[PDB]
Amino acid sequence: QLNSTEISELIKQRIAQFNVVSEAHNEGTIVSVSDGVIRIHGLADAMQGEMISLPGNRYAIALNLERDSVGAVVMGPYADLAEGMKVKATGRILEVPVGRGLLGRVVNTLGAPIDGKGPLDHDGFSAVEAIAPGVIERQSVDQPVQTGYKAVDSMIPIGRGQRELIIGDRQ
Amino acid sequence: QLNSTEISELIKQRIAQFNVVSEAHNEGTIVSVSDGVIRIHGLADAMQGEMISLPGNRYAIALNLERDSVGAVVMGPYADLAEGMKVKATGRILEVPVGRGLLGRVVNTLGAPIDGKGPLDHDGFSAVEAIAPGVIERQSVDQPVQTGYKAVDSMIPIGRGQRELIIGDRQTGKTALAIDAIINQRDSGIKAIYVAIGQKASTISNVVRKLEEHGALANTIVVVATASESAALQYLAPYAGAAMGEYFRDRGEDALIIYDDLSKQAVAYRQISLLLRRPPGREAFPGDVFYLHSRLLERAARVNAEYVEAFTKGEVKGKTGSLTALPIIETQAGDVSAFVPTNVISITDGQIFLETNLFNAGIRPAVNPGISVSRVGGAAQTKIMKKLSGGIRTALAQYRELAAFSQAASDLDDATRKQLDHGQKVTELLKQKQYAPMSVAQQSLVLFAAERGYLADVELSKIGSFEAALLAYVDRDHAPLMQEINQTGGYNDEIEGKLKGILDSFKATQSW
Amino acid sequence: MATGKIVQVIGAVVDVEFPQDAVPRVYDALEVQNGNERLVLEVQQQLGGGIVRTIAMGSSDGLRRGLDVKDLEHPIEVPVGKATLGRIMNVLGEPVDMKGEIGEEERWAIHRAAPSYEELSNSQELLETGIKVIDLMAPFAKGGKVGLFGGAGVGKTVNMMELIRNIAIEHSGYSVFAGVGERTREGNDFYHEMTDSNVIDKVSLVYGQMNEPPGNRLRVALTGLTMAEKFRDEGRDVLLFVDNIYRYTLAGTEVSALLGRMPSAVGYQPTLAEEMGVLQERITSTKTGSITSVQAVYVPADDLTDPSPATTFAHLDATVVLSRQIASLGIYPAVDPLDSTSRQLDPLVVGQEHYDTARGVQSILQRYQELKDIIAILGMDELSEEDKLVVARARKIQRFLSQPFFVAEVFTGSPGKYVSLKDTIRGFKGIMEGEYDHLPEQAFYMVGSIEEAVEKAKKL
Amino acid sequence: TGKIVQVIGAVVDVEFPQDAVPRVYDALEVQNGNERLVLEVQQQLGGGIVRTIAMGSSDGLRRGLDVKDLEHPIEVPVGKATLGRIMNVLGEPVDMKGEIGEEERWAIHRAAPSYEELSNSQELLETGIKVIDLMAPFAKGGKVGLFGGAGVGKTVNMMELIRNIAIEHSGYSVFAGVGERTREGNDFYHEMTDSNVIDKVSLVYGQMNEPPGNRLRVALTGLTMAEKFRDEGRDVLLFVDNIYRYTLAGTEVSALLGRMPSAVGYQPTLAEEMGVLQERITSTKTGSITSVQAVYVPADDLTDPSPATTFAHLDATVVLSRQIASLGIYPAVDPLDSTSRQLDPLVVGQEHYDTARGVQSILQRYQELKDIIAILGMDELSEEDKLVVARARKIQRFLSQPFFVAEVFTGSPGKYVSLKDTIRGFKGIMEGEYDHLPEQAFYMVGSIEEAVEKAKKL
Amino acid sequence: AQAEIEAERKRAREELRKQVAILAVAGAEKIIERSVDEAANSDIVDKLVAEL
Amino acid sequence: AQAEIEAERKRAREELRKQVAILAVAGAEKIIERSVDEAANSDIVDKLVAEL
Amino acid sequence: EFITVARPYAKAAFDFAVEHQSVERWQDMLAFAAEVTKNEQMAELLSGALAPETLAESFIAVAGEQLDENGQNLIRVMAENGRLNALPDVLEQFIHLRAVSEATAEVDVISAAALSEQQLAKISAAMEKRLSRKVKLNAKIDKSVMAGVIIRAGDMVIDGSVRGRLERLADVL
Ligand SMILES: Nc1ncnc2c1ncn2[C@@H]1O[C@H](COP(=O)(O)OP(=O)(O)OP(=O)(O)O)[C@@H](O)[C@H]1O
Ligand SMILES: Nc1ncnc2c1ncn2[C@@H]1O[C@H](COP(=O)(O)OP(=O)(O)OP(=O)(O)O)[C@@H](O)[C@H]1O
Ligand SMILES: Nc1ncnc2c1ncn2[C@@H]1O[C@H](COP(=O)(O)OP(=O)(O)O)[C@@H](O)[C@H]1O
Ligand SMILES: [Mg+2]
Ligand SMILES: [Mg+2]
CATH number of the domain where residue G43 is located: 1.10.520.20
Ligand 1 touching residue B173 (CB < 6 A): yes
Cα-to-centroid distance, D402 and ligand 2 (Å): 13
For residues C48 and C91, the answer to whether their CB atoms sit within 8 Å is no
**DSSP codes of every residue in D228-282:** HHHHTT-EEEEEES-SHHHHHHHHHHHGGGS---BTTTB-TTHHHHHHHHHTTSS
CATH number at residue D47: 2.40.10.170
Phi, psi for C312 (deg, rounded to 5): -65, -40
Q: Number of helices (H) and strands (E), helices first, in chain D?
A: 13, 16
For residues D222 and D243, the answer to whether their CB atoms sit within 8 Å is no
Residues C374, C452, single domain; the answer is: yes
How many whole angstroms from its chain centre is CA G36?
17
Residues C247, C387, single domain; the answer is: no
Q: Which residues of C are catalytic?
A: 156, 182-183
Beta carbons of D150 and B345 less than 8 Å apart = yes
For residue B303, the 8-state DSSP code is: B
Beta carbons of E12 and B4 less than 8 Å apart = yes
Q: Whole-angstrom Cα distance, residue B87 to residue B54? A: 5
Q: Whole-angstrom Cα distance, residue B43 to residue B89? A: 7
Nearest CA in chain B to G164: B22
For residues C434 and C385, the answer to whether their CB atoms sit within 8 Å is no
Phi, psi for B364 (deg, rounded to 5): -135, 135
Report the 3 state secondary structure along D48-84: HEEEEEECCCCCCCECCCEEEEECCCCEEEECHHHCC
- Residue F32 corresponds to which amino acid? I
Q: Reduced to 3 states, what is the DSSP secondary structure of residue D148?
A: strand
Dihedral, B114, B117, B123, B124 alpha carbons, nearest 10 = 40
Closest to B305 (Cα-Cα) out of B244, B255, B251, B246: B251
Residues D129, D229, single domain; the answer is: yes
CB atoms within 10 A of CB G144: 11
Closest to B371 (Cα-Cα) out of B329, B333, B331, B336: B336
Buried b (16+ CB within 10 A) or exposed e, D271-293: eebbeebbebbbbbeebbbbbbb
Closest to C165 (Cα-Cα) out of C108, C133, C203: C203
For residues C217 and C247, the answer to whether their CB atoms sit within 8 Å is yes
- Residue D396 corresponds to which amino acid? Q
Dihedral, G17, G23, G28, G29 alpha carbons, nearest 10 = -10
Nearest C-alpha of chain D: how many angstroms from A169?
10
Q: Whole-angstrom Cα distance, residue G86 to residue G90? A: 6
List the beta bridge partners of residue D70. Answer: D27
Kindly list the residues from chain G whose CB atom is less than 8 angstroms away from the CB atom of residue E30: 169
For residues B182 and B220, the answer to whether their CB atoms sit within 8 Å is yes
Nearest C-alpha of chain G: how many angstroms from E22?
16
Distances (CA, A) of A30 to C77, C379, D72, G41: 61, 91, 22, 42
Peptide bond into B365 cis (omega under 30): yes
DSSP E strand stretches across D95-234 = 104-107, 143-148, 173-178, 201-206
Q: Determine if residue C11 is labeled as part of a ligand binding site.
A: no
Closest to C452 (Cα-Cα) out of C391, C410, C426: C426
Q: Whole-angstrom Cα distance, residue C330 to residue C349? A: 34
Q: Which of B209, B282, B375, B417 is catalytic?
A: B375
> Of D291, D313, D340, at which residue does a domain stop?
D340
DSSP E strand stretches across B35-168 = 37-42, 50-53, 59-65, 70-74, 86-93, 95-97, 106-108, 125-127, 165-168
Residues D285, D369, single domain; the answer is: no
Report the 3 state secondary structure along chain C: CCCEEEEEEECCEEEEECCCCCCCCCCCEEEEEECCEEEEEEEEEECHHHEEEEEECCCCCCCCCCCEEEECCCCCEEEECHHHCCCEECCCCCECCCCCCCCCCEEEECCCCCCCHHHECCCCCEECCCCHHHHHHCCEECCCEEEEECCCCCCHHHHHHHHHHHHHHCCCCCEEEEEEEECHHHHHHHHHHHHCCCCHHHEEEEEEECCCCHHHHHHHHHHHHHHHHHHHHCCCEEEEEECCHHHHHHHHHHHHHHHCCCCECCCECCCHHHHHHHHHCCCCEECCCEEEEEEECCCHHHCCCCHHHHHHCCCCCEEEEECHHHHHCCCCCCECCCCCEECCCCHHHHCHHHHHHHHHHHHHHHHHHHHHHHHHHHCHHHCCHHHHHHHHHHHHHHHHCCCCCCCCHHHHCCCCCCCCHHHHHHHHHHHHCCCCCCCCHHHCCCCCCHHHHHHHHCCC
Q: Whole-angstrom Cα distance, residue G168 to residue F28? A: 13
Is the residue at C196 inside a domain? yes
Contacts of D28 (CB under 8 A, 6+ apart): D2, D14, D22, D38, D39, D40, D41, D52, D67, D68, D69, D70
Residue count (chain E): 52
Radius of gyration of chain D (CA): 25
Nearest C-alpha of chain B: how many angstroms from D240?
16
Closest to D288 (Cα-Cα) out of D71, D389, D406, D142: D142
Range of the domain at G75: 2-99
Is the residue at C409 inside a domain? yes
Cα-to-centroid distance, C317 and ligand 4 (Å): 13
Q: Determine if residue D3 is labeled as part of a ligand binding site.
A: no
Q: Whole-angstrom Cα distance, residue B299 to residue D182? A: 10
Q: CB of E31 within 8 Å of any CB in chain G? A: yes
- Residue F33 corresponds to which amino acid? E
Contacts of C267 (CB under 8 A, 6+ apart): C253
Q: Whole-angstrom Cα distance, residue D419 to residue D128? A: 9
Here the contacts of C276-279 (C-beta below 8 Å, separation 24 or greater) are: C276/B227, C276/C249, C276/C311, C276/C312, C276/C314, C276/C315, C277/B198, C277/B226, C277/B227, C277/B228, C277/C315, C278/B228, C278/C114, C279/C221, C279/C222, C279/C225, C279/C248
Strand-pair category, D235-240 with D316-319:
unpaired
CB atoms within 10 A of CB G35: 13
Q: Whole-angstrom Cα distance, residue B359 to residue D353? A: 49
In angstroms, the first-to-last Cα distance of chain C is 77
Helix (H) or strand (E) holding E6: helix E2-31
Is the residue at C347 inside a domain? no
The residues whose Cβ lies within 5 A of ligand 4, an ion, are B 175
Contacts of E48 (CB under 8 A, 6+ apart): E20, E21, E24, F23, F26, F27, F30
Q: Determine if residue D394 is labeled as part of a ligand binding site.
A: no
**Burial of D59 by CB count in 10 Å (0-12 exposed, 13-18 middle, 19+ buried)?**
buried
For residue B271, the 8-state DSSP code is: H
**Burial of C410 by CB count in 10 Å (0-12 exposed, 13-18 middle, 19+ buried)?**
exposed
Distances (CA, A) of D52 to B155, D39, D145, D206: 48, 6, 32, 19
Radius of gyration of chain B (CA): 26
Contacts of C66 (CB under 8 A, 6+ apart): C5, C6
For residues B160 and B139, the answer to whether their CB atoms sit within 8 Å is no
Closest to C222 (Cα-Cα) out of C91, C346, C97: C91
Is the residue at C438 inside a domain? yes
Phi, psi for C111 (deg, rounded to 5): -80, 110
Degrees (nearest 5) of the Cα angle B120, B124, B125? 95
Q: Whole-angstrom Cα distance, residue A104 to residue D143? A: 29
Ligand 1 touching residue B433 (CB < 6 A): yes
Dihedral, A32, A37, A42, A45 alpha carbons, nearest 10 = 180
List the beta bridge partners of residue C4. Answer: C69
How many whole angstroms from its chain centre is CA B496?
35
Ligand 3 site residues, Cβ closer than 6 angstroms: C 152-158, 332, 405, 408, 411
Q: Determine if residue D316 is labeled as part of a ligand binding site.
A: no
Distances (CA, A) of D332 to B168, B407, C409, D329, D403: 24, 26, 67, 6, 12
HSE at residue C268, side-chain half, CA atoms within 13 A, is: 26
How many whole angstroms from its chain centre is CA D457?
40
Residues D43, D125, single domain; the answer is: no
Q: Does an interface of 3+ CB pairs under 8 Å exist between C and E?
A: no
Q: Whole-angstrom Cα distance, residue A24 to residue A10? A: 17
Range of the domain at D99: 76-340
**DSSP codes of every residue in B97-134:** E-SGGGTT-EEETTS-B-STT-S---SSEEESS-PPP-
Residues D80, D62, single domain; the answer is: no
Ligand 1 pocket test, candidate residues B171, B197, B367, B432, most atoms within 8 A of CB: B171
For residues B359 and B336, the answer to whether their CB atoms sit within 8 Å is no
In angstroms, the first-to-last Cα distance of chain F is 58
Degrees (nearest 5) of the Cα angle E27, E32, E37? 80
> Of C290, C307, C342, at which residue does a domain stop?
C342
Residues C107, C160, single domain; the answer is: yes
Degrees (nearest 5) of the Cα angle B418, B422, B424? 115
Closest to B441 (Cα-Cα) out of B477, B471, B476: B471
Residues C101, C33, single domain; the answer is: no
CB atoms within 10 A of CB B179: 24
Q: Given in angstroms, what resolution was this structure solved at?
A: 4.0
Atom 31, ligand 1: residue with shortest CA distance: C346
Residues D85, D151, single domain; the answer is: yes
Buried b (16+ CB within 10 A) or exposed e, B419-443: beebbebbbbbbbbebeebbbbbbb
Radius of gyration of chain G (CA): 21
For residue A47, the 8-state DSSP code is: P
Q: Reduced to 3 states, what is the DSSP secondary structure of residue D156?
A: helix
Q: Reduced to 3 states, what is the DSSP secondary structure of residue F4?
A: helix
Atom 17, ligand 3: residue with shortest CA distance: C155
In angstroms, the first-to-last Cα distance of chain D is 79
List the beta bridge partners of residue D13. Answer: D6, D51
For residue E4, the 8-state DSSP code is: H
For residue B279, the 8-state DSSP code is: P
For residues B301 and B163, the answer to whether their CB atoms sit within 8 Å is no
Distances (CA, A) of C460 to B184, C397, C441: 60, 18, 11
Residue pairs spanning B and E at CB distance below 8 A: 25
> Of D75, D90, D111, at which residue does a domain stop?
D75
Closest to D201 (Cα-Cα) out of D181, D176, D219, D168: D176
DSSP E strand stretches across E1-52 = none
Residues C114, C127, single domain; the answer is: yes
Is the residue at C36 inside a domain? yes
Peptide bond into A55 cis (omega under 30): no
Q: Whole-angstrom Cα distance, residue C391 to residue C372? A: 8
Residues D163, D297, single domain; the answer is: yes
For residues C319 and C312, the answer to whether their CB atoms sit within 8 Å is no
Cα-to-centroid distance, A50 and ligand 4 (Å): 64
Q: Whole-angstrom Cα distance, residue D218 to residue C103? A: 73
Q: Whole-angstrom Cα distance, residue B116 to residue B96? A: 19
| Widest CA span in chain F | 61
Is the residue at D345 inside a domain? no
Closest to D297 (Cα-Cα) out of B337, B399, B65: B337
CA torsion sign, D411 to D413 to D416 to D417? negative
For residues B6 and F13, the answer to whether their CB atoms sit within 8 Å is no
Ligand 2 touching residue D406 (CB < 6 A): yes
- Residue A71 corresponds to which amino acid? G
Cα-to-centroid distance, C312 and ligand 4 (Å): 15
List the beta bridge partners of residue B167. Answer: B329, B353
List the beta bridge partners of residue B221. Answer: B193
Closest to C42 (Cα-Cα) out of C54, C52, C24: C54
Closest to D210 (Cα-Cα) out of D243, D250, D182: D182
Nearest CA in chain E to F5: E1
Q: Determine if residue D98 is labeled as part of a ligand binding site.
A: no
Number of structural domains, chain C?
A: 3
CATH number at residue C148: 3.40.50.300
Q: Whole-angstrom Cα distance, residue G48 to residue B401? A: 77
Which experiment gave this structure?
cryo-EM
Ligand 1 touching residue B175 (CB < 6 A): yes
CB atoms within 10 A of CB A156: 10
CATH number at residue D373: 1.10.1140.10
Distances (CA, A) of G128 to F49, G109, G124: 12, 14, 6
Distances (CA, A) of B464 to B429, B449, B451, B459: 7, 13, 16, 10
Q: Whole-angstrom Cα distance, residue C102 to residue B63? A: 49
- Residue C110 corresponds to which amino acid? I
In angstroms, the first-to-last Cα distance of chain G is 42
Q: Whole-angstrom Cα distance, residue D199 to residue D173? A: 10
Atom 28, ligand 2: residue with shortest CA distance: B375
Residues C327, C265, single domain; the answer is: yes
The answer to whether residue D154 is catalytic is yes
Phi, psi for E11 (deg, rounded to 5): -55, -50
Peptide bond into D331 cis (omega under 30): yes
3-state helix, strand, coil in chain G (%, to 5): 60, 15, 25
